[PDB]
Structures are given as structure tokens and as C-alpha cells.
Amino acid sequence: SKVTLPPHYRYGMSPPGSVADKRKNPPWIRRRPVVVEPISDEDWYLFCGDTVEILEGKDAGKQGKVVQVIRQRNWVVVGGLNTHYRYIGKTMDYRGTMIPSEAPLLHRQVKLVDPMDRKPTEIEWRFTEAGERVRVSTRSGRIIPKPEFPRADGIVPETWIDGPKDTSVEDALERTYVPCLKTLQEEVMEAMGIKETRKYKKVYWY
Amino acid sequence: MPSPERLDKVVDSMDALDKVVQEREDALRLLQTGQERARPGAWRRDIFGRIIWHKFKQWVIPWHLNKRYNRKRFFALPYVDHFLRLEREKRARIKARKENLERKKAKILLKKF
Amino acid sequence: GADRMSKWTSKRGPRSFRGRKGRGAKGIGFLTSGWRFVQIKEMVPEFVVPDLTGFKLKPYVSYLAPESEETPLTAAQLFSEAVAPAIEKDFKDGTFDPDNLEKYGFEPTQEGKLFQLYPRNFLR
Amino acid sequence: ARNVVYPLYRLGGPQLRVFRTNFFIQLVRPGVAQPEDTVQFRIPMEMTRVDLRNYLEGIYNVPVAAVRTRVQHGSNKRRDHRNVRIKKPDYKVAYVQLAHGQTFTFPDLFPEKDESPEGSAADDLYSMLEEERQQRQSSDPRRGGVPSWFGL
Amino acid sequence: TEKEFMQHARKAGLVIPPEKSDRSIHLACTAGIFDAYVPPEGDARISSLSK
Amino acid sequence: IGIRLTLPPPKVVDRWNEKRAMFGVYDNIGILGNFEKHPKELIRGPIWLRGWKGNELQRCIRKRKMVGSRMFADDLHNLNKRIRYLYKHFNRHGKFR
Amino acid sequence: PLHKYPVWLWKRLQLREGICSRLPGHYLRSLEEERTPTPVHYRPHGAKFKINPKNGQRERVEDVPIPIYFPPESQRGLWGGEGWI
RNA sequence: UCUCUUACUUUUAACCAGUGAAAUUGACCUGCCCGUGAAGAGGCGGGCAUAACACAGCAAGACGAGAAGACCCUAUGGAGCU
RNA sequence: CCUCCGCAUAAGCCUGCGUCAGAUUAAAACACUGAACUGACAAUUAACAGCCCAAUAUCUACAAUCAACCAACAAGUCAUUAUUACCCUCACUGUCAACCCAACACAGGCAUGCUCAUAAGGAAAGGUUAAAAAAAGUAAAAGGAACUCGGCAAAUCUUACCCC
RNA sequence: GCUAAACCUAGCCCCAAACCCACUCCACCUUACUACCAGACAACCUUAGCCAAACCAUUUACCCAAAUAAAGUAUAGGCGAUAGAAAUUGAAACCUGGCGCAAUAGAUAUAGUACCGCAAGGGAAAGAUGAAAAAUUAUAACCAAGCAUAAUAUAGCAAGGACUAACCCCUAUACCUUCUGCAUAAUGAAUUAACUAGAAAUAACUUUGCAAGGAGAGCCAAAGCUAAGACCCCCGAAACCAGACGAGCUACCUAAGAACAGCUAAAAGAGCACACCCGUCUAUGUAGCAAAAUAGUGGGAAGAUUUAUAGGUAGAGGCGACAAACCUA
Ligand SMILES: [Mg+2]
Ligand SMILES: [Mg+2]
Ligand SMILES: [Mg+2]
Ligand SMILES: [Mg+2]
Ligand SMILES: [Mg+2]
Ligand SMILES: [Mg+2]
Ligand SMILES: [Mg+2]
Ligand SMILES: [Mg+2]
Ligand SMILES: [Mg+2]
Ligand SMILES: [Mg+2]
Ligand SMILES: [Mg+2]
Ligand SMILES: [Mg+2]
Ligand SMILES: [Mg+2]
Ligand SMILES: [Mg+2]
Ligand SMILES: [Mg+2]
Ligand SMILES: [Mg+2]
Ligand SMILES: [Mg+2]
Ligand SMILES: [Mg+2]
Ligand SMILES: [Mg+2]
Ligand SMILES: [Mg+2]
Ligand SMILES: [Mg+2]
Ligand SMILES: [Mg+2]
Ligand SMILES: [Mg+2]
Ligand SMILES: [Mg+2]
Ligand SMILES: [Mg+2]
Ligand SMILES: [Mg+2]
Ligand SMILES: [Mg+2]
Ligand SMILES: [Mg+2]
Ligand SMILES: [Mg+2]
Ligand SMILES: [Mg+2]
Ligand SMILES: [Mg+2]
């Protein structure tokens, strides 16, 4: 869950704690770092879910949808577009099920596309005076909304039913706090009826 | 394990509760005595010349007739000034190497792009 | 050579070194003349548990609960929510005295009570 | 509680009361045969016998009769790849005995899975895998090496 | 005089992407066929125009 | 074997740099800027050798004099030993005496 | 690399840094006084220039002191301005 | 012990199967007699000998291998002692 | 078939032949699978032994050796009272192993109690042949030191003299 | 064709500028990582020496106030090796760099970690694919010593002249160093890859520039002055001094302990003889089981004995039933 990675550790289209990730780069390994474009956390525009357009590769010009961003190498993987082929089920006597897998593209090789006329377009982070922060097209001047993508919790809010050990909403927000100058200790000691009558004597701290 | 995220959820929920209770005690202590650090202590300089935050230890008799506390030495005794200077220079060398490597890495990035 | 790097635990020395070390448990008494241990009941910690019978609050929260901004409690906020209406009200009636602050919850010195705050009498 | 400085007991002082305790224990299945009332736990190092008695008699209302604890030595023999030793941690196991003639047997938590929901994100791929494996394994020793794809 | 070999590897792919992720594999086909076209038994016998 | 199998990447150098194009500008400043500055005041280097050629013994002596009050301890001891060794070398050993 | 300040100025820098800065200023002057003692264990020169034998040319003359060592018994009682040589 | 050695057993030893060192090594396709030679030759001169190659022994030679002779001499080199 | 070993305590080390899986590889001086191993899992539970004592004064000449005669010199290994204070009780630590010090799975070193040959504990021979040389043994015709610096070694038991 | 070979990039070096850091909770001077009790002891001290004087005995730059000049001048000095000022002059505020290294290089460093020693302390080695390894594909092959594909053919510093043919035929005393002289049977070297050894002055020569003047203050000058080029190695001792670390082996001592079967016991620093301590002689072993053992044979074994634990005496010394013996092989 909370594991520190080596200082020059490659990021490799698997999650960092996975099994084949521990297969690929074990803690023994030391290889050349991939020098990458440093990009601020305010200028990065494309998120995980919006439609994009590939500019160069084996299939330039086609549009598609990104499925993951790997920010440690400025990577995106568009859905089923920049693909190659690999066999999944493999044994010593049989291997088939040839399934296409995507290949990661840099952010320079990928342009965002506006839903009005559906062309690749350059973007500006034109901050709105009405409070919020949203992307704005340059050439046509249309607002590009951040798309709704299912969150990383693995859960959806609307069809969520409370279990036995899930507290209700109305009891999660009931304000019982009456602010007073007591500690928690003496408060629950007088709530529980516990009575202590003998004194704490002088003690020498040094 | 069936669902391992449940243990993480209970752990950081209890840490949120401990943080709330400690915040209430700390605000009440600032209003009543105006001191942070409910374990009282004092900046002292130990035998190796370092400056530390010594925490007090809640004894029964006062300090001047404590036999164990009077063997612990809180002073510098000037043969350690040379070793203090050497440690200072070692820290300066490490910081200089880090800053120069940052210079070089930024030059590599402006080289490639 | 002996093993320098592995830490010095209670299992390592001679027969006198074993027993004098311990593993970190806070003692609850004292040894008297005939090697007897006398437990003192006021030193062994008494767990103060409540009755959880009609309690309606679970170890998890429902995801339907809304979010809000975090605000850590500050001593000015505790002053404003605790003492400021009382001092404000009895100052409007002109009966407020700066001399006696003890009637609003202020304590001049912690030496009297049981749960004294700055030397931290209480355990946890 | 652990990692918390205890208030020193001057004689005739108040009762040391811990309110939000800090100890977390693990009921654990034994590795050897034990009698019917012995219930083996796994407790932190800073816990005593009397603390385990009051812990089980305050929170779970378990009537406890006798408690015996011991320290287990975690192994320190595994080397890393740079030959520095990796330390399995020490821990403290404790065996409580129930009081009033009660018995205890450790349950079986894992047997037995009976589940067959709809599968899309994992079992549709398993259905693809299994149907490809059921179809394509029709090799013939009488063809002798020829590919069985051409209708000719 | 204290050195060993390297390269513990395995030669069979497996099902890591459901072990946890939020990207599923984008297929472009299916496994088999929906319902098999059973041809007529005399298709070479009726290999002319019609009957 | 010592030789490399593949020839190295092409080393491309910009001859019309910023630094290469203005190299030697404000050199020759004293002659035709009526001698307000020396061309040795254009040198940017260590504070002891700015306009001074010197030996190896002379460079070490000048560095100890001009800077050795504020050097690090190990560097100062290494400079002391270097001056001791170079005195012993230049004034006792060699040919041509 | 090099230190910014020389090694012999770190004492005055420590005087200007922390609680030593909050000492009263006349104490700081009396501490940073650094004046010379009267001669005890040597005879000082009379003049500033002393014509010498073997060439009748005047030379500058200074008088340098003796590095005399004072044990702690000199701190316990009033000695002169004298100690061990 | 010897005149004067002999027989048997075990270890060792030879072959088979497994694992598997160390000193040494300028390169060698590495013979004998006489003579010569930095004065004691497998490599030089005159004669003689001469298909290639395994395995077990012996120690006449390789001025044999380990230790920049420990004996002799020198150093305007050391040290102990009187 | 051997046992001159073994079981414990102390000292030392710190999980170092318990289970499952890998044994495709890796150390087994070879292999099975396990002392020259990888990962995971589980154990050593105190009554045994450590960890102790409220003060101020005061007291303490007649050894031990079955302690009983006798007999000694090196003259010895063990003790309380008066007054005040004192009424709570079983907390903590060690407990595993085929193990320590010698670079090693080393014919070396290692304190005490117990049975002085065992109720414990183990295997000198990988298989074949019966060469030379070498080592350890057994036996030998007649002679018995004739060998050698010297009766060295071995075998039997062995007298007398001298120097220091 | 196996072992193999190849990689760039982690980082580092020298400068400039700038004065730099340190409690999340608990534990950490007693046996540090230990929650908890009555003698309170406490720091202030000229460095020495190797080395040069071709020995060595006074002597021998190292000292912490910016440069240049006066100047290597006055001075000091077995007046000798060498040491060496001062009066005085003046010292243009700001710029983020490399005719530096690239895994035997550069910090020792992936690290003061592994490993060695009781302790102070010593102290390493190494990694290389690709845009994608959620592409394990078929390539990419070619190159040191060493081997295999593929053992040998009479004769001889291994080769040369050749020749129709590899050999056969004629000629030929390996290299470096030290030497009057080496094939010498005088030293060094198994081989391959990488690393590993000429640093500078006064005075002279040449080439420019100026010229009785030269030089960007100071210094020289009866053709001189200024600038440049060109030129003086590496490894190796026994030793000396200063400060720390060592009595867990061993020499002795102190504290409180433990062991010594059986027989004859004359009474006993008595006799035979176990356990135990030591090691007279022989044999094996000599990179051995062992950096001092094994087997036999031996001396002591109720004492000046042996031994378990802790402490003490440390190098200009400790200790010593004097072996100039021992003080971590
Ligand atoms: Mg001859
Ligand atoms: Mg020869
Ligand atoms: Mg020889
Ligand atoms: Mg010699
Ligand atoms: Mg001479
Ligand atoms: Mg001499
Ligand atoms: Mg000498
Ligand atoms: Mg001496
Ligand atoms: Mg046991
Ligand atoms: Mg048996
Ligand atoms: Mg055999
Ligand atoms: Mg006979
Ligand atoms: Mg004879
Ligand atoms: Mg004879
Ligand atoms: Mg004999
Ligand atoms: Mg000399
Ligand atoms: Mg000389
Ligand atoms: Mg390196
Ligand atoms: Mg080759
Ligand atoms: Mg010939
Ligand atoms: Mg010749
Ligand atoms: Mg020579
Ligand atoms: Mg000669
Ligand atoms: Mg030779
Ligand atoms: Mg010679
Ligand atoms: Mg040789
Ligand atoms: Mg001793
Ligand atoms: Mg006797
Ligand atoms: Mg005897
Ligand atoms: Mg003696
Ligand atoms: Mg003598």
C-alpha cells in the first residue's frame, strides 16, 4: 500500500505494486532513467476519459478515448487505437487467444478534440472569472468540459445501499458537539458516574 | 484476504479520530496555560556538542540529589569544536553536490528540448 | 566477533542480564524483601469502557454523505464558541469584571485539579 | 496504551485510567493441540497479563480465568540482495483460559465458496479463453503436420 | 568466492490485469459463433440454380 | 576486446552560438576605451588567480595566502601537505642543478 | 568549496546571531575591547626608532609580548599580572 | 636393530562412477658422445641416433619448485645493550 | 560392529535438518530428499532461574574435616538486638535447535552434576583388483646389539658406577 | 559456436555566488535506545619527529591580518644549509561556469553497507534490450586470451631463402635489465583486456613588437627592453615522533568459588595409579584434522596443584621462580 520506490524506477504500464511489475524491475535492477518533459500540475489538460485524436503513428488521424494516464512518463493510452497483438493464454503445448493491446503515446503525440466541429484543437487554461477553472479552445473558443469518469474507489454513489456496518447519512451529520472547556477525560468521567476524590501530588519533572 | 481495504479504512478512520481529540486537547491547553508540548522539555547541548530537545522524565525527588541524573553531562567541553566544524563541512559538501547535480539535470532537460 | 548490528534484546546476555532488561511493559509495583512482588492496584491501568447498547453510529460511513471543507479547530475558535457569548452577554449588562475570570471557565493555575493540562496528568 | 508516557504514581494518588486505549490484538488459530478452554491471542509487546485480563473483561465481556504470555523470537536469517539481514519482527503471544467452564474451538472462515454471478470484466474474458480452448484443440496425428485451415 | 546465478523467469502469460486495475482490455472480436449455420444435406445435390 | 561495435551518436555542435559568436567582444577594451579597464578585469575565475599565471608551488602558495583562512579543514590540510611536498620536490630533487 | 566568512570571525558572528545579541551593548563593547596588557615579564623598548650598532641607520622597533600561562590558582586569588613562563 | 630378509591384514595404491584443488609455467616441434663457450650445453661446431601415441614406476639432469641467503662484504642505512 | 560416550546446568550463538510448496536452477564435496537452501506458515506458556530488602544506634573470641576422642597450623567459608515506620499482593524477563571459540559440517580447545558402560549415542568399507613405492599392525628358522653417533624403535623386564 | 565482447548514465571533480542544519508519539550516559529515589568527582598546560646540512650535536619555510611592488632588500644563521621582514604604494560595487571525469575513470561509496579485528581501525565489487515486456518475436550476426568444429608424422629459438608439394634441402646461440663480457645454467615475465612513470628556475637560442629607450606604475638599459616557444620521472625499506585502542590469549595480582576414583596410608609441597594439567622420546603429517595435530611412550596428579566468573597493572611501559620469556596467531 505505502511502499517507497527506488529513485530511478521505470514506470511501465503495470501498476507499481503488481506481480509482473515485480517481475520486470526487481529491487536489484538499475537502468538508465528516462528523461521526460516536466509539466506543471496546472497546465496538464487531457484527463482520463475525454476523446482525443492521434497525430502520428501507425494510425494517425483517427479519434478515440483515453483509458488511463501515466503521469510519471507523460503517457496516455487511447482505447484500442495504437495497438499491437499478443497471445494471452500461453502454455508449453498450446497458445492462442490473440488479443490486441494498446501502446502508450506521449502527450505531444496526442491532441484534444472539441465536440462542436470534431477536429484536433489547441487548448488554453483560460481561468473563469466566475470562480472555477476550465479548459478553453484557442482557435474556435469553445469550453471543453472535464468528462465524467468513474472514480478510483470502485464505487458509484447513486446505486449505493448501506450495509449493516455503514452508518446512515442523517446520523453521520447530527451535531452533538456542545463546546465546553472540559477535556474528553473529565467529561466522560462525569458522564459515566466515576468519582475520584483523592488528589494528585507534586511531581518533579526534569 | 477477502477485502483488504477495510483494515486501511478502519486504521485511517481511527487516526482521524485521534487527530480530532488531540486538536481539542491542544486548543484547550493553549487557552488554559498557553503552552504547546504537554510533555515539557528544554533545549540542551549534550556531550557531543549537538543541540537537542531534551524531554523531561517525571521523577520523584528533585534533580540536585538524583544520583543517576547527575552522571549525565549536558555541556560541550571544547575538544568537540573541531568535530563540529568537520560535520558542518560534511553537510556543506553534501548540499553543494545536490545543488550542482540539479544544475546539471536542468541543463540536460534544456539540451533535449 | 560478537554480533554488533542486531539490536540488544532481553534474550542475549548472561543469567544476570536476562531479567534486568525487559521488553517495554510499564511496571505495576515494587519488589520487597523476600523477592516478592507487590502489585499496587492504582498503578495498573483501568480500562474505562462505555455501554454501547443503544448506540447508533457505525465503523463506516455511507457514501451518500456529502463532503465539506476541512477546518482544524483553533484556540480562537474554541474561545469564540465557548466563552464569548457568556462574556458578551454579561458585559452588555455591565456586570463583567476583568478581576474574576474564573466564573467563565478560566483557571488561574492547574495545581488543584485532577486533569491538569500542561504537565498532562491524564494518560490518553 | 502504548507510546504514551505514564503518569508517575505518588503513593495515595488517583487511579490510573486509560480512556481511548491503543492496543490491538489478534485471536489466532494455534499451531499445536491445546485444551478446550485455551484461547490463543497475539498482543503487542507493551501489554501485560493483567492488561489482557482487563481488556477482555471490559470490551468483550469474556470471563477470563488464567493468562500466560511469552515472547516469540522473529527470525533474522534472511539476507537481502546486498547481504544485509531482513528482520522478521518479534511478537508476544498469549493464551487465555475461559473461566466458567466455557470451551472454544477456532472456526473455519474460508470453506466453502458457492457463487456464480454474471461475469463481464473478468469472466467474459474467461468465457472467451475457455471457448477458444474448447474449439481449437482438434489436432490430428493422421495429418502429420499439415495445417488444418485450408478447405482444399 | 561467494556468487550465484541470476534470471528466475517463467514462460506462461496469465491474468494479472484483473488482479486489480481500472482499464480493461479492448477486444475487437468474439470467441466463437452465435448459432451455427447448418447447411442442407444435399447442397452439392442441389448445387444448380434451384428446385 | 577494447573497440566499440557501433559507431557513436552524431555529436552536433552549434558554431553560431550565443557564447561562440560574442567570444572576444570587450576584449581589447583598454586600448580603445582609453584605458579605464584592463583586459585582465574581464577574467572570471577563482578569486586568487585572476590575472596571474604561476607555477604549481606558486599557485598553491597564493591560494593558501588569499583564501586559506576560509577553506574547509581537510582541504586546508591537503594544501599544507601539497606545499610541503612541492617544496621538497622543487628545491631538492630533479636534474639541472 | 569555501566558507563565506573566515574561520576566525565565527565568534563575532555567534555574538551577532542569537541570545548573545540581546546582551546590553556596553557589555558587548567591553567583551570586544581587545586591549594590550602592561609589560610584566619583559622590558619594553623606549622609543619607536632605535639606531643600532654596526650601521648608523635608524630601524623601527616593536616590542612583542611573552605568551605567559595562567593556571586556575591565578583565577582563585590576586596574582600580579604575572604567571608561568 | 642386524647377519638377511619373508609371509598375511588394513590404510595407501591401480581401474570404474561423481565432485574436484595447490605450488610451477619466456616460447618449445624439448635426444647421445667429444670439443667450445660468462670457465658444468637438449638449442653452438664435428659425428651418432631418429615413424606417431597412450599408461605404471625411478629420481641421474632441467646449475628443479616455495622463501629479493639467515654465512661474508658495503651503505657517511637502522635498532637493542653496556 | 563401535562407544573415551551421553543426558542436563552454566557460558556462547540467535531460529541455524518442525509442516507445505520449489525442487527447472542453486550449496548436498554424488544422489535420494536434506544439517553446507528458497519462500510461506507455526512454536519456547512457570512452580525452574533471574529481577530484592525503611531507617538510626547496637551486637557478632571458641573453624571446617560424619565433629564424637586424639592431634595440629597455613588460624579459617555463614549469627542479632532496641525504638520508630509498615497491614496492598504473584507484575516483568530466559525457556526452540543437530548450536560455542578456531576463515570450514575442522582427528583442536571448552566449567559443573549425573549412570562409569550403558535404558543414552553412532557407522571404520562408493564398487572392483591384489601390481611397485609408502604408513600402521601380526608372525618368524639359527644367532641375540654382531646395526647404529648413541639399545633410536620394538621386546622383556632389568644390575652396578660416575658428573651435575 | 560456447565462454564471451559492445553500450550511456547513474553520479562525481574543480569554481563562482551565498554564511548552514537539526523534537510526529515513545525510548536513549546503568550493560546507551532501560517510565519511576539521598554524595553532591568534574575543562583550562611550549607539540614532537621524519627530513636538509650529503653524518650529526645549534639550526630546517608550515604560523590563518586579501593582491602587485619595495624584495628575495635590510637582517638572522656550526655567518652554513637555509630562514627573512619593515617604513612606504595601492586592492572598479551586479552576471547560473568547465580546450573536467563517464563504471579498473570520477568522492571509498548502489556503501562506510557486505566482509575482517576484542577494540581503535581497515574496507570492497557491481548496472546496461526496447516508444510499448499489459510485445518474450527471432534474431541480427562479425572482434582478446581459452577451447570445439579439426590430435599426432624423423630434425631440433620454431623462422627465413625457396620450391610444383605442408615436411624433407641450406642459414640461424629468444627479449629486457645488470655488466669488460650473457644463449648462458645471472634477474624479470603463463596469457589476454584495462590502468600504470620527465612537474620548474637563472643564464643562453629562435621568432615577433618597440628602440636609446622598452614595459598597462614597481624593473632593466654604454642595443637594450617586452612577449612567446622550448627543459629537469615511478614503485620499494628497516626506522623516528604524537595521539588514541587493547590483560576475553598470555605474565602477575585481587574478590568469592569448584575439582581431585581406588590402593599402600610411616607422619608427609610421600609412593603406584584414574579423571585432569604438562609435553621426554619415537613415527605419521608438512597447501596437513591442525598457521603446531594425531598414535604410541612419558612427568605431576592433597598441592609452590588445576580450573569456572568478574576486576586491576600498557608501551620512554606493564608483568616476569631472568627464558631480554609474555603483553590477541
Ligand atoms: Mg660440455
Ligand atoms: Mg635451458
Ligand atoms: Mg632450486
Ligand atoms: Mg638480495
Ligand atoms: Mg662512505
Ligand atoms: Mg647512520
Ligand atoms: Mg638517522
Ligand atoms: Mg628507541
Ligand atoms: Mg532446554
Ligand atoms: Mg541407541
Ligand atoms: Mg574406495
Ligand atoms: Mg627370529
Ligand atoms: Mg659397524
Ligand atoms: Mg657396534
Ligand atoms: Mg625405548
Ligand atoms: Mg640528514
Ligand atoms: Mg641525499
Ligand atoms: Mg568506481
Ligand atoms: Mg578468439
Ligand atoms: Mg636442419
Ligand atoms: Mg656469445
Ligand atoms: Mg641488479
Ligand atoms: Mg659480473
Ligand atoms: Mg635466463
Ligand atoms: Mg642480482
Ligand atoms: Mg621466474
Ligand atoms: Mg584475565
Ligand atoms: Mg604427591
Ligand atoms: Mg605419581
Ligand atoms: Mg611463574
Ligand atoms: Mg640469561
mmCIF file of C-alpha atoms in Angstrom, chain C residues 48-94:
data_model
loop_
_atom_site.group_PDB
_atom_site.id
_atom_site.type_symbol
_atom_site.label_atom_id
_atom_site.label_comp_id
_atom_site.label_asym_id
_atom_site.label_seq_id
_atom_site.Cartn_x
_atom_site.Cartn_y
_atom_site.Cartn_z
ATOM 1 C CA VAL C 48 -12.845 2.944 31.006
ATOM 2 C CA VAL C 49 -15.350 1.500 28.529
ATOM 3 C CA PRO C 50 -18.887 2.799 27.875
ATOM 4 C CA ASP C 51 -22.150 0.982 27.283
ATOM 5 C CA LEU C 52 -22.654 0.590 23.529
ATOM 6 C CA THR C 53 -26.241 -0.655 23.808
ATOM 7 C CA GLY C 54 -28.490 1.935 22.186
ATOM 8 C CA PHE C 55 -25.670 3.439 20.161
ATOM 9 C CA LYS C 56 -26.360 4.326 16.530
ATOM 10 C CA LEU C 57 -23.001 5.033 14.896
ATOM 11 C CA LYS C 58 -21.124 2.529 12.745
ATOM 12 C CA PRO C 59 -17.421 1.904 11.976
ATOM 13 C CA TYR C 60 -18.001 3.029 8.369
ATOM 14 C CA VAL C 61 -19.915 5.861 6.712
ATOM 15 C CA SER C 62 -22.408 5.724 3.856
ATOM 16 C CA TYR C 63 -21.144 7.057 0.541
ATOM 17 C CA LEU C 64 -24.343 9.126 0.235
ATOM 18 C CA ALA C 65 -22.993 11.509 2.900
ATOM 19 C CA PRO C 66 -21.957 14.890 1.458
ATOM 20 C CA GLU C 67 -18.496 16.399 1.686
ATOM 21 C CA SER C 68 -17.347 19.709 3.144
ATOM 22 C CA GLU C 69 -14.188 21.711 3.686
ATOM 23 C CA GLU C 70 -11.740 20.665 6.386
ATOM 24 C CA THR C 71 -11.165 23.168 9.191
ATOM 25 C CA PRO C 72 -8.862 22.207 12.080
ATOM 26 C CA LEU C 73 -10.031 23.606 15.403
ATOM 27 C CA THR C 74 -8.085 26.639 16.609
ATOM 28 C CA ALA C 75 -7.938 28.130 20.102
ATOM 29 C CA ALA C 76 -9.562 31.358 18.907
ATOM 30 C CA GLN C 77 -12.475 29.326 17.539
ATOM 31 C CA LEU C 78 -12.790 27.433 20.824
ATOM 32 C CA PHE C 79 -12.769 30.749 22.706
ATOM 33 C CA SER C 80 -15.410 32.178 20.361
ATOM 34 C CA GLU C 81 -17.714 29.158 20.588
ATOM 35 C CA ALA C 82 -17.246 28.577 24.332
ATOM 36 C CA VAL C 83 -16.723 31.755 26.333
ATOM 37 C CA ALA C 84 -17.539 34.680 24.010
ATOM 38 C CA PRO C 85 -21.394 34.568 24.252
ATOM 39 C CA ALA C 86 -21.255 34.454 28.068
ATOM 40 C CA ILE C 87 -18.728 37.290 28.383
ATOM 41 C CA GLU C 88 -20.572 39.249 25.676
ATOM 42 C CA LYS C 89 -23.936 38.846 27.437
ATOM 43 C CA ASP C 90 -22.777 39.713 30.933
ATOM 44 C CA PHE C 91 -20.771 42.629 29.530
ATOM 45 C CA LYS C 92 -23.952 44.013 27.938
ATOM 46 C CA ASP C 93 -25.480 44.074 31.425
ATOM 47 C CA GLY C 94 -22.343 45.851 32.698
#
